[PDB]
Design a protein around this motif. Structure first.
Motif, PDB file in Angstrom:
ATOM      1  N   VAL A  75      -4.559  -4.100  -0.245  1.00  0.00           N
ATOM      2  CA  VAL A  75      -3.239  -4.289   0.344  1.00  0.00           C
ATOM      3  C   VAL A  75      -3.366  -4.969   1.705  1.00  0.00           C
ATOM      4  O   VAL A  75      -2.564  -5.839   2.054  1.00  0.00           O
ATOM      5  CB  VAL A  75      -2.492  -2.947   0.487  1.00  0.00           C
ATOM      6  CG1 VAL A  75      -1.226  -3.122   1.304  1.00  0.00           C
ATOM      7  CG2 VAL A  75      -2.169  -2.376  -0.888  1.00  0.00           C
ATOM      8  N   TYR A  76      -4.388  -4.580   2.461  1.00  0.00           N
ATOM      9  CA  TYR A  76      -4.685  -5.219   3.740  1.00  0.00           C
ATOM     10  C   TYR A  76      -4.932  -6.712   3.561  1.00  0.00           C
ATOM     11  O   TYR A  76      -4.421  -7.530   4.325  1.00  0.00           O
ATOM     12  CB  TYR A  76      -5.902  -4.564   4.400  1.00  0.00           C
ATOM     13  CG  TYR A  76      -6.600  -5.450   5.409  1.00  0.00           C
ATOM     14  CD1 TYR A  76      -6.063  -5.657   6.675  1.00  0.00           C
ATOM     15  CD2 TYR A  76      -7.795  -6.086   5.095  1.00  0.00           C
ATOM     16  CE1 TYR A  76      -6.699  -6.468   7.598  1.00  0.00           C
ATOM     17  CE2 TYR A  76      -8.436  -6.900   6.010  1.00  0.00           C
ATOM     18  CZ  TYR A  76      -7.885  -7.088   7.260  1.00  0.00           C
ATOM     19  OH  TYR A  76      -8.517  -7.897   8.178  1.00  0.00           O
ATOM     20  N   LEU A  77      -5.719  -7.052   2.545  1.00  0.00           N
ATOM     21  CA  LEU A  77      -6.050  -8.441   2.250  1.00  0.00           C
ATOM     22  C   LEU A  77      -4.803  -9.262   1.944  1.00  0.00           C
ATOM     23  O   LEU A  77      -4.653 -10.383   2.429  1.00  0.00           O
ATOM     24  CB  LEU A  77      -7.025  -8.517   1.074  1.00  0.00           C
ATOM     25  CG  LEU A  77      -7.486  -9.918   0.672  1.00  0.00           C
ATOM     26  CD1 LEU A  77      -8.159 -10.614   1.843  1.00  0.00           C
ATOM     27  CD2 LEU A  77      -8.418  -9.857  -0.528  1.00  0.00           C
ATOM     28  N   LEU A  78      -3.911  -8.692   1.142  1.00  0.00           N
ATOM     29  CA  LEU A  78      -2.661  -9.354   0.783  1.00  0.00           C
ATOM     30  C   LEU A  78      -1.792  -9.592   2.013  1.00  0.00           C
ATOM     31  O   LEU A  78      -1.136 -10.629   2.131  1.00  0.00           O
ATOM     32  CB  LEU A  78      -1.896  -8.525  -0.250  1.00  0.00           C
ATOM     33  CG  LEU A  78      -2.578  -8.349  -1.607  1.00  0.00           C
ATOM     34  CD1 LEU A  78      -1.768  -7.426  -2.504  1.00  0.00           C
ATOM     35  CD2 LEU A  78      -2.792  -9.698  -2.274  1.00  0.00           C
ATOM     36  N   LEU A 102       6.716  -5.037   7.422  1.00  0.00           N
ATOM     37  CA  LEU A 102       5.577  -4.768   6.549  1.00  0.00           C
ATOM     38  C   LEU A 102       4.597  -3.802   7.209  1.00  0.00           C
ATOM     39  O   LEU A 102       3.990  -2.965   6.538  1.00  0.00           O
ATOM     40  CB  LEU A 102       4.864  -6.068   6.178  1.00  0.00           C
ATOM     41  CG  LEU A 102       5.643  -7.023   5.269  1.00  0.00           C
ATOM     42  CD1 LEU A 102       4.829  -8.276   4.991  1.00  0.00           C
ATOM     43  CD2 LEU A 102       6.030  -6.331   3.969  1.00  0.00           C
ATOM     44  N   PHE A 103       4.446  -3.937   8.524  1.00  0.00           N
ATOM     45  CA  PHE A 103       3.633  -3.027   9.325  1.00  0.00           C
ATOM     46  C   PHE A 103       4.105  -1.589   9.125  1.00  0.00           C
ATOM     47  O   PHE A 103       3.304  -0.693   8.860  1.00  0.00           O
ATOM     48  CB  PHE A 103       3.705  -3.424  10.805  1.00  0.00           C
ATOM     49  CG  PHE A 103       2.823  -2.606  11.715  1.00  0.00           C
ATOM     50  CD1 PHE A 103       1.734  -1.904  11.222  1.00  0.00           C
ATOM     51  CD2 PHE A 103       3.090  -2.546  13.074  1.00  0.00           C
ATOM     52  CE1 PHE A 103       0.934  -1.157  12.068  1.00  0.00           C
ATOM     53  CE2 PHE A 103       2.292  -1.801  13.923  1.00  0.00           C
ATOM     54  CZ  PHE A 103       1.213  -1.106  13.420  1.00  0.00           C
ATOM     55  N   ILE A 104       5.411  -1.383   9.245  1.00  0.00           N
ATOM     56  CA  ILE A 104       6.009  -0.068   9.052  1.00  0.00           C
ATOM     57  C   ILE A 104       5.774   0.455   7.638  1.00  0.00           C
ATOM     58  O   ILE A 104       5.386   1.610   7.451  1.00  0.00           O
ATOM     59  CB  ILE A 104       7.523  -0.097   9.332  1.00  0.00           C
ATOM     60  CG1 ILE A 104       7.798  -0.630  10.739  1.00  0.00           C
ATOM     61  CG2 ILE A 104       8.125   1.284   9.147  1.00  0.00           C
ATOM     62  CD1 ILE A 104       7.091   0.134  11.837  1.00  0.00           C
ATOM     63  N   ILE A 105       6.008  -0.404   6.650  1.00  0.00           N
ATOM     64  CA  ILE A 105       5.829  -0.039   5.249  1.00  0.00           C
ATOM     65  C   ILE A 105       4.395   0.397   4.967  1.00  0.00           C
ATOM     66  O   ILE A 105       4.168   1.376   4.256  1.00  0.00           O
ATOM     67  CB  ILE A 105       6.197  -1.204   4.308  1.00  0.00           C
ATOM     68  CG1 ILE A 105       7.654  -1.617   4.514  1.00  0.00           C
ATOM     69  CG2 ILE A 105       5.966  -0.814   2.857  1.00  0.00           C
ATOM     70  CD1 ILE A 105       8.641  -0.500   4.275  1.00  0.00           C
ATOM     71  N   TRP A 157       3.260   4.118   3.593  1.00  0.00           N
ATOM     72  CA  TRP A 157       2.588   4.096   2.300  1.00  0.00           C
ATOM     73  C   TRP A 157       1.179   4.671   2.397  1.00  0.00           C
ATOM     74  O   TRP A 157       0.696   5.321   1.469  1.00  0.00           O
ATOM     75  CB  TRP A 157       2.541   2.669   1.753  1.00  0.00           C
ATOM     76  CG  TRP A 157       1.788   2.551   0.470  1.00  0.00           C
ATOM     77  CD1 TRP A 157       2.236   2.878  -0.776  1.00  0.00           C
ATOM     78  CD2 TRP A 157       0.449   2.071   0.303  1.00  0.00           C
ATOM     79  NE1 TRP A 157       1.260   2.633  -1.708  1.00  0.00           N
ATOM     80  CE2 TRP A 157       0.153   2.137  -1.073  1.00  0.00           C
ATOM     81  CE3 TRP A 157      -0.528   1.594   1.182  1.00  0.00           C
ATOM     82  CZ2 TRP A 157      -1.078   1.742  -1.589  1.00  0.00           C
ATOM     83  CZ3 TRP A 157      -1.749   1.203   0.666  1.00  0.00           C
ATOM     84  CH2 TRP A 157      -2.014   1.280  -0.707  1.00  0.00           C
ATOM     85  N   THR A 158       0.523   4.425   3.526  1.00  0.00           N
ATOM     86  CA  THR A 158      -0.819   4.938   3.765  1.00  0.00           C
ATOM     87  C   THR A 158      -0.793   6.453   3.959  1.00  0.00           C
ATOM     88  O   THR A 158      -1.694   7.163   3.511  1.00  0.00           O
ATOM     89  CB  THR A 158      -1.464   4.264   4.995  1.00  0.00           C
ATOM     90  OG1 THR A 158      -1.623   2.864   4.740  1.00  0.00           O
ATOM     91  CG2 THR A 158      -2.827   4.873   5.301  1.00  0.00           C
ATOM     92  N   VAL A 159       0.251   6.945   4.616  1.00  0.00           N
ATOM     93  CA  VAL A 159       0.392   8.376   4.868  1.00  0.00           C
ATOM     94  C   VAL A 159       0.767   9.146   3.603  1.00  0.00           C
ATOM     95  O   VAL A 159       0.202  10.205   3.325  1.00  0.00           O
ATOM     96  CB  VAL A 159       1.448   8.652   5.961  1.00  0.00           C
ATOM     97  CG1 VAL A 159       1.782  10.136   6.031  1.00  0.00           C
ATOM     98  CG2 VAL A 159       0.957   8.152   7.309  1.00  0.00           C
ATOM     99  N   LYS A 160       1.713   8.606   2.838  1.00  0.00           N
ATOM    100  CA  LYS A 160       2.230   9.290   1.654  1.00  0.00           C
ATOM    101  C   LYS A 160       1.143   9.580   0.621  1.00  0.00           C
ATOM    102  O   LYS A 160       0.985  10.719   0.181  1.00  0.00           O
ATOM    103  CB  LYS A 160       3.347   8.469   1.006  1.00  0.00           C
ATOM    104  CG  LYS A 160       4.059   9.196  -0.125  1.00  0.00           C
ATOM    105  CD  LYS A 160       5.064   8.306  -0.841  1.00  0.00           C
ATOM    106  CE  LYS A 160       4.434   7.571  -2.017  1.00  0.00           C
ATOM    107  NZ  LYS A 160       3.473   6.517  -1.596  1.00  0.00           N
ATOM    108  N   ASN A 161       0.393   8.550   0.242  1.00  0.00           N
ATOM    109  CA  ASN A 161      -0.673   8.707  -0.741  1.00  0.00           C
ATOM    110  C   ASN A 161      -1.985   9.165  -0.112  1.00  0.00           C
ATOM    111  O   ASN A 161      -3.059   8.981  -0.684  1.00  0.00           O
ATOM    112  CB  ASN A 161      -0.889   7.399  -1.504  1.00  0.00           C
ATOM    113  CG  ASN A 161       0.128   7.198  -2.611  1.00  0.00           C
ATOM    114  OD1 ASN A 161       1.132   7.907  -2.683  1.00  0.00           O
ATOM    115  ND2 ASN A 161      -0.131   6.231  -3.483  1.00  0.00           N
ATOM    116  N   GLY A 162      -1.889   9.760   1.071  1.00  0.00           N
ATOM    117  CA  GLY A 162      -3.045  10.315   1.747  1.00  0.00           C
ATOM    118  C   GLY A 162      -2.784  11.748   2.162  1.00  0.00           C
ATOM    119  O   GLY A 162      -3.629  12.391   2.784  1.00  0.00           O
TER     120      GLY A 162
END
Ligand SMILES: CCCCCCCCCCCCCCC
Ligand SMILES: CCCCCCCCCCCCCCC
Ligand SMILES: CCCCCCCCCCCCCCC
Ligand SMILES: CCCCCCCCCCCCCCC
Ligand SMILES: CCCCCCCCCCCCCCC
Ligand SMILES: CCCCCCCCCCCCCCC
Ligand SMILES: CCCCCCCCCCCCCCC
Ligand SMILES: [Ca+2]
Ligand SMILES: [Ca+2]
Length: 293
Positions: A107-110, A134-137, A141-146
Motif C-alpha cells: 500500500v505504501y508503494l502504491l 490518503l495520509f489520513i486513510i 486503515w493501519t490501526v484498524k487491521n492492527g
C-alpha cells in the motif's frame, strides 16, 4: 563563542542518544497496552512525532516563497529513511516480514507511485489535499487491521514516550544550532551547508529512534517507523507545503524514491530485510548523495 557551539552540539547528541531509547521503550509498552504490533505504533505515533520537524519546515519555507525547499526536503527525507536509516537497521537486526505487513508495504508503494505521477507537473494545493486525505486513510486503515482507570504502568509508559520525543526533537535542533554556531564562528559558513544541515537535522529523530529500536531487535518498529515517516513526509510535509505555493517538480528524485520503494517491497515480499539488503540500500543512498542536487 566557539565553546558554546560544541556545548550545544554534544548536548544535543546526549539528548538524542538517551531520548531515542526512552521513546522506543515507551512506544513498545504502549503498543502492548493497546494490543497492537510494534509496526503499527511505529507507523503512526512514532512516525508523526518525528515527522513534525519536516511538516513545520515545509509549511514555513513554501509560505516564504521557497517551494523547492519544501519538496526537496520531503523527498530527500524519504530517500534517507530507506537508504540510510533502514539500511543501517537491516544490517543491525535483520527482519523477516510477516505476510500482513507485506500488505501494508504494498500500500505504501502504491501511495508513492501515485504521488510520483501527480507530481510530474509539480504539486498543486489540490494535489496536497488529495495526498493529505490518503495520509489520513492510511493511518486509520493501519490501526484498524492492527488492533483487537489510571494504571501506573500506563502513566509511566506515556512519560517515557513523551519525554523521549521531546528529547530527540530538542536534541536534534541543538545539534543543528550547535553546528551552525560553530560554522559561523569559524567563518566557514556556507548557505548550502546550512540547508543540507537543517534538512539532515529533520531526519535525525528517525535515525536515532530506528537505531535504538534495532539495538533491541525491534525490526517491526523500525520498518513501521520508516514506512510511516515517508508517508508523513509526502502526505504531510509535502502536502502542506503545496497548500501555500505550487511545488516545482522533482522528477529525478521521485524516480529514485519509487525504485527504492519498489526494492523495499520486493525484499519484504519474496525475501528478507537483512545484511545484504541493507548494504544495497546504503550503497544506493551513497550514490544518491554523490550525484543528486
Ligand atoms: C494508480 C494510479 C497512479 C497514477 C494516478 C495518476 C492520477 C493523475 C493522472 C493524470 C496526471 C497528470 C499529470
Ligand atoms: C491507504 C490509502 C491509500 C492507498 C493507496 C492509494 C493510491 C491511490
Ligand atoms: C478505527 C481506528 C481509527 C484510528 C484513528 C486514529 C487517528 C486518525
Ligand atoms: C486539515 C487542514 C486542511 C487545510 C487545507 C487548506 C487548503 C488551502 C488551499 C488554498 C488554495 C489557494 C488557491 C489560490 C488560487
Ligand atoms: C539503476 C537501477 C538500480 C535499481 C536497484 C538495483 C539493485 C540491484 C539489483
Ligand atoms: C547500484 C545500481 C545502479 C545505481 C546507479 C548507478 C549509475 C549512477 C549514475 C549517476 C550519474
Ligand atoms: C539507482 C538507485 C539510487 C539513486 C540513483 C540516482 C541516479 C541519479 C542520476 C541523475 C542525477 C542528476 C542530478
Ligand atoms: Ca523527521
Ligand atoms: Ca500536479
Amino acid at each position: 563563542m566557539v565553546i558554546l557551539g560544541v556545548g550545544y552540539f554534544l548536548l544535543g547528541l546526549i539528548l538524542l542518544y538517551y531520548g531515542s531509547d526512552w521513546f522506543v521503550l515507551g512506544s513498545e509498552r504502549i503498543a502492548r497496552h493497546f494490543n497492537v504490533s510494534n509496526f503499527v505504533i511505529g507507523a503512526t505515533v512514532m512516525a508523526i512525532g518525528t515527522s513534525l520537524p519536516e511538516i513545520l519546515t515545509s509549511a514555513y519555507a513554501s509560505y516564504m516563497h521557497a517551494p523547492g525547499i519544501s519538496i526537496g526536503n520531503a523527498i530527500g527525507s524519504c530517500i534517507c529513511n530507506i537508504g540510510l536509516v533502514l539500511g543501517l537497521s537491516a544490517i543491525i537486526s535483520p527482519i523477516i516480514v510477516d505476510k500482513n505487513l507485506q500488505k501494508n508495504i504494498l500500500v505504501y508503494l502504491l501511495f508513492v507511485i501515485f504521488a510520483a505521477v501527480i507530481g510530474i507537473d509539480g504539486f498543486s494545493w489540490i494535489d496536497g489535499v488529495v495526498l493529505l486525505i490518503l495520509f489520513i486513510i492510511y493511518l486509520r486503515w493501519t490501526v484498524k487491521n492492527g488492533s483487537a482507570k489510571n494504571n501506573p504502568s500506563v502513566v509511566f509508559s506515556l512519560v517515557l514516550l513523551i519525554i523521549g520525543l521531546i528529547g530527540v526533537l530538542v536534541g536534534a535542533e541543538l545539534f543543528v544550532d550547535g553546528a551552525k554556531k560553530i560554522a559561523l564562528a569559524l567563518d566557514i559558513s556556507d548557505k548550502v551547508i546550512g540547508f543540507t544541515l537543517v534538512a539532515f537535522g529533520t531526519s535525525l529523530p528517525e535515525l536515532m529512534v530506528s537505531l535504538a529500536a534495532a539495538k533491541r531487535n525491534l525490526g517491526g518498529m523500525v520498518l513501521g517507523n520508516v514506512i510511516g515517516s515517508n508517508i508523513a513526509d509526502i502526505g504531510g510535509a509535502l502536502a502542506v507545503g503545496s497548500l501555500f505555493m505550487h511545488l516545482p517538480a522533482e522528477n529525478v528524485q521521485m524516480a529514485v524514491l519509487v525504485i527504492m520503494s519498489l526494492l523495499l517491497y520486493l525484499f519484504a515480499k519474496y525475501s528478507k530485510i537483512g545484511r545484504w539488503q541493507g548494504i544495497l540500500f546504503l550503497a544506493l543512498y551513497i550514490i544518491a548523495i554523490a550525484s543528486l542536487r
